[PDB]
Design an enzyme around this catalytic site. Structure first.
Site, PDB file in Angstrom:
ATOM      1  N   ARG A  60       0.861  -1.176   0.000  1.00  0.00           N
ATOM      2  CA  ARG A  60       0.000   0.000   0.000  1.00  0.00           C
ATOM      3  C   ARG A  60       0.896   1.224   0.000  1.00  0.00           C
ATOM      4  NH1 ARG A  60      -4.763  -1.225  -1.991  1.00  0.00           N
ATOM      5  NH2 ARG A  60      -5.801  -2.899  -0.810  1.00  0.00           N
ATOM      6  N   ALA A  72     -10.021  -8.272  -2.187  1.00  0.00           N
ATOM      7  CA  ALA A  72     -10.977  -7.197  -2.390  1.00  0.00           C
ATOM      8  C   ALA A  72     -10.761  -6.415  -3.677  1.00  0.00           C
ATOM      9  CB  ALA A  72     -10.934  -6.257  -1.215  1.00  0.00           C
ATOM     10  N   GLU A  89     -13.158 -11.084  -8.269  1.00  0.00           N
ATOM     11  CA  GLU A  89     -11.946 -10.718  -7.534  1.00  0.00           C
ATOM     12  C   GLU A  89     -11.393 -11.841  -6.654  1.00  0.00           C
ATOM     13  OE1 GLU A  89     -10.031  -7.954  -7.627  1.00  0.00           O
ATOM     14  OE2 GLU A  89     -11.233  -6.425  -8.662  1.00  0.00           O
ATOM     15  N   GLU A  93      -7.647 -12.882  -7.356  1.00  0.00           N
ATOM     16  CA  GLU A  93      -6.661 -12.663  -6.297  1.00  0.00           C
ATOM     17  C   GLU A  93      -6.167 -13.889  -5.522  1.00  0.00           C
ATOM     18  OE1 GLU A  93      -7.783  -9.398  -3.720  1.00  0.00           O
ATOM     19  OE2 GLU A  93      -7.301  -7.907  -5.261  1.00  0.00           O
ATOM     20  N   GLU A 138      -0.867  -5.964  -7.652  1.00  0.00           N
ATOM     21  CA  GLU A 138      -1.283  -7.359  -7.574  1.00  0.00           C
ATOM     22  C   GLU A 138      -0.214  -8.352  -8.049  1.00  0.00           C
ATOM     23  OE1 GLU A 138      -5.045  -8.296  -9.189  1.00  0.00           O
ATOM     24  OE2 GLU A 138      -6.105  -6.584  -8.297  1.00  0.00           O
TER      25      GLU A 138
HETATM   26 MN   LIG Z   1      -7.653  -5.863  -4.715  1.00  0.00          MN
HETATM   27 MN   LIG Z   2     -10.376  -4.690  -9.593  1.00  0.00          MN
HETATM   28 MN   LIG Z   3      -8.108  -7.067  -7.745  1.00  0.00          MN
END
Ligand SMILES: [Mn+2]
Ligand SMILES: [Mn+2]
Ligand SMILES: [Mn+2]
Ligand SMILES: Nc1ncnc2c1ncn2[C@@H]1O[C@H](COP(=O)(O)CP(=O)(O)OC[C@H]2O[C@H](O)[C@H](O)[C@@H]2O)[C@@H](O)[C@H]1O
Ligand SMILES: Nc1ncnc2c1ncn2[C@@H]1O[C@H](COP(=O)(O)CP(=O)(O)OC[C@H]2O[C@H](O)[C@H](O)[C@@H]2O)[C@@H](O)[C@H]1O
Ligand SMILES: [Mn+2]
Ligand SMILES: [Mn+2]
Ligand SMILES: [Mn+2]
Lengths: 200, 200
Positions: A60, A72, A89, A93, A138
Site C-alpha cells: 500500500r 478485495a 476478484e 486474487e 497485484e
Molecule cells: Mn484488490
Molecule cells: Mn479490480
Molecule cells: Mn483485484
C-alpha cells in the site's frame, strides 16, 4: 438541519473525485465539508471446510509498506453487480471459487471525509480454480491461509490493520464462535456509493 | 520496487491534503497514485464496571445521515499526545474520565487512497465529569450506553457501520469474552500519519 448549499468539484482522478460542499450547521452557520467520492468496494472472507481463510500481503503506497488484507476489489465496473465483483476478484486474487455466498459485514471506511463503503462477503464451499496474470500492486502481492482464530489474534496484536480485513476477520470470528450468523445476499447495503460512479 | 518518482500537491483543505505521486510499478511502468494526507485520529471504547460502553449518534455529511460511533477526535492539535487527545475527546463527547488507559486496536481506515490511521483505546475505571458546550456536528449528536455484546450484535446486524466503531466494538468484545487482552499505552503505532501535520 445540515442542508447542502453549494457543491464544487475540486478534483476528479482515477478512482475518486474530490468535492467541496457548503453545509449549514446547527448554529445557523455554513461550513466547508469536503467529501472524497469513491466507487465503493467489496471484500471476501472465503472460509474453507476447516475454518481457514485466505489473506493477501499487498503493498500500500499510502503507508509505504505491505499489509495483510482480505481479497478485495473496487466497484469500478459500471453495471457489474457487487456479488459478481466479489466472485470475480476472489478468483483473480486468491484463485478460488465458492458455491455459497452470504453477507458478512458492511463498513463505512472513513466517514469523516469519504463516501466509500465496503461490503464484506463470507464465501463457503470453496473450490480451487485458475488464477490470471496479475498487474501492478497485484503482481507483487502474495497470500497465506490462516485459521480464523489466529487471524483474529493477529488483529488484536496489530499484525492486521486494514479496516476491511479487521471487520471481516473479527466478524467471521464472531460467526465461528456461534455469536452471530451470516446474512442473505439481498441484505440492504445502506451506504453503497453512487456519486463517483454517477459522474460518468 | 515501488519508488516514488514525483510528488505533486493537488489540494490542501481543512483536514487533509490531496497529493498525486508517480510510482514505479513491478513491470517497470510508472503510475498515478493519489494519496489523501490526514491528521490521523483516535477513538475510545470506554468500558464501565458492568461491561457497558458509550456510543454517539453523529451526523455524517459524507453519507447524509447519522451513524453510531465511538467517541473520537482528529489529531489536529500539533504537539498534543494521542492518549491526551483521547482523554480530552472522551470528556468533551461523552463527559467521561478514566483512571486506566490501554491500547485496544489500531486500524488503517482506507489503505487504498489515504494515510489516515486510527488508534482505538480501551478506557476503564470511569468517572462522570462535566461536558463542554458543543459546536457543529457535535452540537447535534446524542449518545447511548450499550452492553458490549449488544453493540457487537448491532455490528453484525448492520446497525453499526463506522469502521472505527466496528473495530473497537468487536475488539473489546473479543477481550470481554477472554479471547484477547488489552495492550500497553506505549504500544507502537506503525502507521500514525505525519504527512499532513508535517505540512505546517
Ligand atoms: Mn484488490
Ligand atoms: Mn479490480
Ligand atoms: Mn483485484
Ligand atoms: N490509488 C490508486 N489510484 C489509481 N489506481 C490504483 C490505486 N490503488 C490501486 N490501483 C490499482 O488497482 C488494482 C487493483 O484493484 P482492486 O483489486 O479492484 C482493488 P484494491 O482495493 O486496490 O485491492 C491495482 O492492481 C492497481 O493497479
Ligand atoms: N470534513 C470536515 N472538514 C472540516 N471540518 C470538519 C469535517 N468533518 C468534521 N469537522 C469538524 O470537526 C469537529 C469534530 O472533530 P473531532 O470530534 O475531533 C473528530 P470527528 O472524526 O469528526 O468525530 C466537528 O464538530 C466539526 O466541526
Ligand atoms: Mn468526534
Ligand atoms: Mn476534535
Ligand atoms: Mn470531538
Amino acid at each position: 438541519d445540515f442542508e447542502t448549499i453549494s457543491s464544487e468539484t475540486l478534483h476528479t482522478g482515477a478512482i475518486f473525485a474530490l468535492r467541496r460542499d457548503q453545509v449549514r450547521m446547527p448554529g445557523g452557520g455554513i461550513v466547508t465539508r469536503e467529501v472524497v467520492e469513491h466507487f465503493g468496494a467489496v471484500a471476501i472472507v472465503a472460509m474453507d471446510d476447516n475454518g481457514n481463510i485466505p489473506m493477501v500481503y499487498q503493498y500500500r503506497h499510502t503507508y509505504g509498506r505491505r499489509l495483510w488484507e482480505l481479497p478485495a476489489g473496487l466497484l469500478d465496473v459500471a453495471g457489474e453487480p457487487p456479488h459478481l465483483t466479489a466472485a470475480r476478484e476472489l478468483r483473480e486474487e486468491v484463485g478460488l471459487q465458492a458455491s455459497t455466498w452470504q453477507v458478512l459485514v458492511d463498513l463505512d471506511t472513513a466517514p469523516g471525509f469519504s463516501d466509500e463503503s465496503v461490503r464484506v462477503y463470507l464465501a463457503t464451499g470453496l473450490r480451487e480454480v485458475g488464477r490470471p496474470e496479475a498487474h501492478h500492486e497485484e503482481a507483487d502481492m502474495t497470500m497465506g491461509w490462516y485459521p480464523i482464530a489466529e487471524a483474529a489474534r493477529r488483529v488484536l496484536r496489530g499484525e492486521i490493520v486494514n479496516s476491511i480485513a479487521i471487520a471481516g476477520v473479527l466478524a467471521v470470528h464472531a460467526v465461528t464462535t456461534g455469536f452471530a450468523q451470516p446474512r442473505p445476499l439481498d441484505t440492504e447495503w445502506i451506504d453503497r456509493p453512487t456519486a463517483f460512479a454517477a459522474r460518468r
